[PDB]
RNA sequence: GCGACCCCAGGUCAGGCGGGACUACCCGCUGAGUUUAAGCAUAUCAAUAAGCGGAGGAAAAGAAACUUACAAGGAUUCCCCUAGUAACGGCGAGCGAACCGGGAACAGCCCAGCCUUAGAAUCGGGCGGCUCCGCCGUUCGAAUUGUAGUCUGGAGAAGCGUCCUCAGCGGCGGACCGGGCCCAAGUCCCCUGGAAGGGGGCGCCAGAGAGGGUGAGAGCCCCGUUGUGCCCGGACCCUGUCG
RNA sequence: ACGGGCGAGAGACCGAUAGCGAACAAGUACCGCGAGGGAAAGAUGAAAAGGACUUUGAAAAGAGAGUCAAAGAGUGCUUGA
RNA sequence: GGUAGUAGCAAAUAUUCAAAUGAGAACUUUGAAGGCCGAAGAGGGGAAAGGUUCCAUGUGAACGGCACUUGCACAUGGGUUAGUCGAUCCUAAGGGUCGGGGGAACCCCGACAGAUAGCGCGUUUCGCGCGUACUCCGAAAGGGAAUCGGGUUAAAAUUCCU
RNA sequence: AAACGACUCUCGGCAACGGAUAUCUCGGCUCUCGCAUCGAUGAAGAACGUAGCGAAAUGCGAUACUUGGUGUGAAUUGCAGA
């Protein structure tokens, strides 16, 4: 060592060359998972690209608090006050989460409101052509139905 | 330009390919064009070369000599033709090889195989 | 002279019997001229004698496994050289129906909430 | 030794039998790249080691 | 002496299961020293090499006895960042995570226990049938020292209302995959050459000028290449329609 | 995730002392009691047309002659420091 | 490459004469002579070890440290015959094991923690009586059922023939 | 009389020795992609055999360089025969 230089701390006195990732696959990777999302898409026809529906949930910590991002599903109090049975959600697109708590008024509003835009903007197809039940869609509604690509609930 | 992806462009694969081929496919591979009366007759381009074949050479010092196949030495990617021969230096005669591309099929000899692979190049042509 | 499959087929198993011995007679005859400093055209022809024998023997162990197969259909426990050979795991594996078997919570699950089939238009 | 195993009889047999020059009509054959025997044995130079 | 049960013994009894092989990845165990520290013992090398086992097409993990202290997130896994950071360390040499945040993908569930007692409603074997990966009938056996069913904390049981939801089959297609067949254009004139595929002239095809072969740098000599058309077979899964 | 298995596509990589040890009957020949160790070795010509025949020699071969565009390409055969 | 056609070819008493073959003979074969091994051999057989080296015919090149017409080299063929000779059977020092006891496991101890194999009599194949946990491996010199002459091949014999 | 010759050395042509150089390549190395299929129904490995003429490699199992079905459609070939 010499000179006047940082003093180096290079975590390089294992057998480091034989546990080196490289990253020539990068591309392949994302050819491969455009084709996987391309195939899903197909097979979910018409349902939503975007998957299911998520809540709107705040970040965690003071360093994230003022900040809203999608969490994993809605709370059973908030499908409840919305009005949609906790068993009958996941089947209609709709996330379900029994393990997030409500603490305010708040996030519980607009998580219904959410979920009310949802169903208000849902069509639902019936499990029988012939038949239709109380939560089926008009004919004229399922005929103009398409898939979304994007997100159609950006939060 | 190649566009399927279960065809290799390299030079290795491609001469291993050919230098491997079996016989049936080096039958394909031996295929000489039709001349132009047989042409215009059946609307086909090129047939496989047969044993008993009319043909004319039309390249080499043999260029203008024809005649009948009489081998289709496939191991050796050659065929040997009536009268094309030569003499060693013991004076004795021997066939000499020739390219079944580097000769011209004068006349086929045809049978219910030989009429329906006709046939078929031809429907394609249209 | 030419001994077809074809030929061999619809004949019965006596005659086949009869024509593998002729032929193995054949066989060693020719094996003997061989050995007696025999000319070029009769050892060629133990290729053929061979050849005649393989097919013949080969049309009798065909024709005995199809009647074995056939006496055994439609039965259980069959011979284990008639059984399904595949690979050992595939033949350890569950039946399709053991595999699709579930309680009747699942059941009444999937009957009672399907996924449905949905679009986002309107 | 005279006193042998059945196995080791055998053995020797073959190793006999593979003790020989190649056919003639071998080096004739087209696109031929063998020459000679490369595994010939002399039971003088490379013993057995059996 | 007979009978019931219990535990155990012998069966080439009827029908099944297991051992072993491979190494790139994966799971469990065991486990150094060379080396670095300018010496060396803790440390480092390394929770590594060697050694002993166990799987699959991935394995493992997985549905909070979690993260946090926020206006709160919400199974597991992986990537970026956190971060060479908090911490650990003869606090020397060195070592070193996790949460939040942004992305890839997403999926949830099954049991034990109180709750048939108007009868084990459960399951295995043999035998006989059937539209035979299973269903039905009959007969033996397992099981009450508990097989079915309900329930799993997100709940749930019971009671009362609401009248909201729930029951298959077969045909023809689409989607996916694996194959088969045919289909463009010069080998025209002159020269050098053993051989034009080289030079010069005149033409042509091109959604085909990727590549290879043939007597020397060949788009048009041959196989192929591009783009259509037709034909065959799997997967019984997804999807549209029809009776 | 994937230096094994089966099947494919590519490369500013190596070009026979290089590149896997192995472009070849290479994990072969060979060595070691054994565990193990482990090579060298690619190129006639377009086509064998692979040199008839004469002569000298015991023979290997030499001198002529012949094939080929070429033997100043004659089977350990492109070139040959 | 120089070294260099140099260092070396020297232990085991020794060769000689005539003839035959051959292109070629100090080295092959025949005969004669002169010597050696001298029965605890330079003779005649086996065990291990080797594996065709055994026998016949022929021979370009290589090899047989000079040479070869030659041969334990090369090439093509041939050759090893058992009721009696051996293995095979028995057990020795010991080895390998069930069960049991250890062991993460590869594995360790080895009849030591145990309902042994089975063996005899008569039979409607069932009954009766005995039954101390290995009926396994381990000797071409230990133990041990049985062959002798005579003859025979290019090469086998107590094996082939009588 | 140090001339001709021999030797040594040196330079050039030619001929030897050796296999460098150049031009090649059915091989190697590297990256990427698809799939998931060994075994008591006896695997991997190991041995012995098998062709008219084979020792090895490759293949195969006394039906032994292959039997049978199907596809293709006139060869295999070093030689001989069918
Ligand atoms: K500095
Ligand atoms: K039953
Ligand atoms: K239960
Ligand atoms: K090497
Ligand atoms: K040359
Ligand atoms: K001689
Ligand atoms: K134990
Ligand atoms: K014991
Ligand atoms: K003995
Ligand atoms: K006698
Ligand atoms: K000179
Ligand atoms: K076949
Ligand atoms: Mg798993
Ligand atoms: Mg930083
Ligand atoms: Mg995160
Ligand atoms: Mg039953
Ligand atoms: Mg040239
Ligand atoms: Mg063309
Ligand atoms: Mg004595
Ligand atoms: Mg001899
Ligand atoms: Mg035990
Ligand atoms: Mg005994
Ligand atoms: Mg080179």
Redesign the pocket.
Known sequence: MKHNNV?????????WQ?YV??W??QP??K???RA??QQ?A??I?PRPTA??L??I???????????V?????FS?EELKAAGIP??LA?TIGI???????N??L??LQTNVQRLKTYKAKLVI?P???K?V???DSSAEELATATQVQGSYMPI | ????????????????A???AP??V????????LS?DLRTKYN???M?????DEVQV??????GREGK?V???????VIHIERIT??????ST?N???????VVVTKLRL?K??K??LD??????? | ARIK??ELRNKTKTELLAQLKDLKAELALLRVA?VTGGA??K??????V??S???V??????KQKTALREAYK?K??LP??L??????????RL????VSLK????K??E??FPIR?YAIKV | ?????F?????????????????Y??R????N??????????????????
């Open positions: 003093i180096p701390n290079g975590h390089f006195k294992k057998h034989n990732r490289t020539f696959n392949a990777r050819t491969r998972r996987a999302r899903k197909v097979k026809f998957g299911s998520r809540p949930v705040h970040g965690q910590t003071l360093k994230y608090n003022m900040k991002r999608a969490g994993r599903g059973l906790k068993k996941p996330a379900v989460d029994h393990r997030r708590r603490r305010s708040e996030g197809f499990r029988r052509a038949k039940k109380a939560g | 330009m190649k566009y399927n992806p279960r065809v290799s462009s390299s030079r290795r694969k491609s001469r291993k050919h230098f491997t016989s049936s080096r039958r394909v591979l031996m295929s000489a064009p132009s086909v381009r090129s496989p070369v047969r044993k008993d039309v390249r080499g010092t043999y260029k196949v081998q289709v030495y496939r191991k050796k990617w030569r003499e060693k230096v013991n004076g021997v000499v090889g020739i390219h079944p591309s580097k049978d195989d030989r329906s692979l078929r190049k031809a429907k394609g042509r249209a | 499959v074809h061989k070029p055209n050892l060629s022809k133990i290729k053929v061979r050849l024998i393989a097919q023997l080969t049309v009798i162990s065909q439609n259980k426990y284990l050289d059984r399904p050979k595949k690979t050992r795991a595939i033949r350890k039946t399709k129906h053991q309680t009747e919570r699942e009444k699950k009957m009672y089939k | 030794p005279s006193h042998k195993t196995m080791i009889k055998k053995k020797l047999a073959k190793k006999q039998r593979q003790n020989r020059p190649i056919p009509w071998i004739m054959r087209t696109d790249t063998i020459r000679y025997n490369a595994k010939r044995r002399h039971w003088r130079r490379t013993k057995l080691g059996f």
